[PDB]
Amino acid sequence: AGTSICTSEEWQGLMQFTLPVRLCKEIELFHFDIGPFENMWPGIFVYMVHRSCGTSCFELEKLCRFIMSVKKNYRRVPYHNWKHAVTVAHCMYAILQNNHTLFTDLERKGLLIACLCHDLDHRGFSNSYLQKFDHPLAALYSTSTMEQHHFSQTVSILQLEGHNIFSTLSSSEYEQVLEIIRKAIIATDLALYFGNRKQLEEMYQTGSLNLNNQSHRDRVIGLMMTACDLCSVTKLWPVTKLTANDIYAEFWAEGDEMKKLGIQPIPMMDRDKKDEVPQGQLGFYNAVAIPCYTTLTQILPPTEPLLKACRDNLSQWEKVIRGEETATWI
Numbered sequence: 001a002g003t004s005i006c007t008s009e010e011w012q013g014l015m016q017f018t019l020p021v022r023l024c025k026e027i028e029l030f031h032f033d034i035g036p037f038e039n040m041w042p043g044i045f046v047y048m049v050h051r052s053c054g055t056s057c058f059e060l061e062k063l064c065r066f067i068m069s070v071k072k073n074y075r076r077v078p079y080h081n082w083k084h085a086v087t088v089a090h091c092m093y094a095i096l097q098n099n100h101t102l103f104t105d106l107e108r109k110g111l112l113i114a115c116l117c118h119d120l121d122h123r124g125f126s127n128s129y130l131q132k133f134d135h136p137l138a139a140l141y142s143t144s145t146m147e148q149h150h151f152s153q154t155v156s157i158l159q160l161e162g163h164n165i166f167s168t169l170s171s172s173e174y175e176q177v178l179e180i181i182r183k184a185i186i187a188t189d190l191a192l193y194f195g196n197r198k199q200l201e202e203m204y205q206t207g208s209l210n211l212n213n214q215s216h217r218d219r220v221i222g223l224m225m226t227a228c229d230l231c232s233v234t235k236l237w238p239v240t241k242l243t244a245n246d247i248y249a250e251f252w253a254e255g256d257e258m259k260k261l262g263i264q265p266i267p268m269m270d271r272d273k274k275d276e277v278p279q280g281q282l283g284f285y286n287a288v289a290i291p292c293y294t295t296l297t298q299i300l301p302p303t304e305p306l307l308k309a310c311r312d313n314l315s316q317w318e319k320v321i322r323g324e325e326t327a328t329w330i
C-alpha cells in the first residue's frame with residue numbers, strides 16, 4: 001500500500017560508501033557473484049553506474065535516494081528480491097562494458113536502471129497465478145501482468161520528491177529513456193522471450209540484422225534483458241545451485257496456494273515433486289537459457305562467457321540426473 005521511501009540515514013550512508021579496491025577488478029567479470037557482499041550491494045550499483053555512465057551522469061543525491069528507495073520496494077521474498085535486482089544489474093553492466101560503444105549513453109543509463117527496477121514490488125506469484133485467480137493486477141494488465149506493474153512501480157519511484165534522476169534530460173531524451181526502460185522491463189516477460197529469440201535468430205542467420213534499425217535494436221536489448229534476468233545460470237555451479245533453492249522456495253509456496261484453491265500445481269511448483277527438479281532444470285536450460293545465450297553470443301561476441309558458463313551448468317544438472325552429485329550445502 002503506497003510507494004515506500006528510503007530514510008535520510010539510508011541514502012546519506014550510501015553517499016559516504018566506498019568500494020574496497022580489490023572488488024573493482026572482480027565486478028568487471030561476468031561470473032562475479034555479489035552473494036558474499038550484502039552490505040555493499042547499493043554501493044556496487046553506484047560504482048557500476050559511475051564507471052559505465054560517468055560520475056556526472058546523475059546528481060549523486062537523487063541517485064542515492066533512488067537506489068535506496070528501489071531497495072525498500074523489493075519485498076522479502078525468497079527469489080524476486082533486492083539481491084536478484086542487483087545481480088541482474090551487474091550482468092547488464094558486464095554486457096555494456098564489453099560492448100560499450102554499441103550503445104548510446106541514454107541506453108546505458110536506461111538499461112542499468114531498468115535492470116535494478118525490473119522486478120519491483122514482486123509478490124512471489126507468477127503471471128500464471130495472477131491470471132488464473134483474477135488478481136486485480138491481471139484486470140489492469142491483461143498480458144505481461146507483473147512486468148507492467150514493475151514498470152509502473154519504477155515510474156512511481158522516479159516521481160518521489162527528489163528521486164527523479166532523469167530530470168536533467170532534454171524533454172525528448174526523457175521520453176526516449178522511459179521508453180527504453182518500459183520496453184526493457186516488458187521484455188523480462190519470458191512469454192515474450194520465445195518469439196523474440198526466434199526472430200533474432202532468423203535475422204542473424206539470413207544476415208538481415210541491422211543495429212541501426214530501431215526495431216532490431218529493441219529486440220537485441222530484449223534478448224539482453226533475458227540473458228541478465230536468467231544470469232544465475234551463468235555463475236559457478238555452487239552459486240547457481242544455491243540460487244535454484246531460492247527460486248523453488250518461491251515456486252513451491254505458489255504451488256501450496258493453488259492447492260488451497262482446488263487446483264493441483266504444475267510439477268515445477270509442487271513441493272511433493274522435488275525428485276523432478278533436475279529434469280525440469282534440464283528442460284529449462286534446453287528450452288530457454290541455452291538458446292538465449294547462444295543467440296546473444298552470435299549477436300554480441302564478447303558475451304560468450306555467459307554461454308560457456310551456462311553450458312557448464314547444464315552439464316552439472318545432467319550429472320545430478322545420472323546420480324553423480326557430490327556434496328552440497330544450502
Ligand SMILES: Oc1ccnc2cc(Cl)ccc12
Nearest residue numbers: 229230231232233280281284
Ligand atoms: O528453471 C527455472 C524456471 C524459471 N525460472 C528460472 C530462473 C533461473 Cl535464474 C533458473 C532456472 C529457472
Ligand code: NI
Nearest residue numbers: 118119146188
Ligand atoms: Ni520478472
Ligand code: NI
Nearest residue numbers: 084118119229
Ligand atoms: Ni527477474
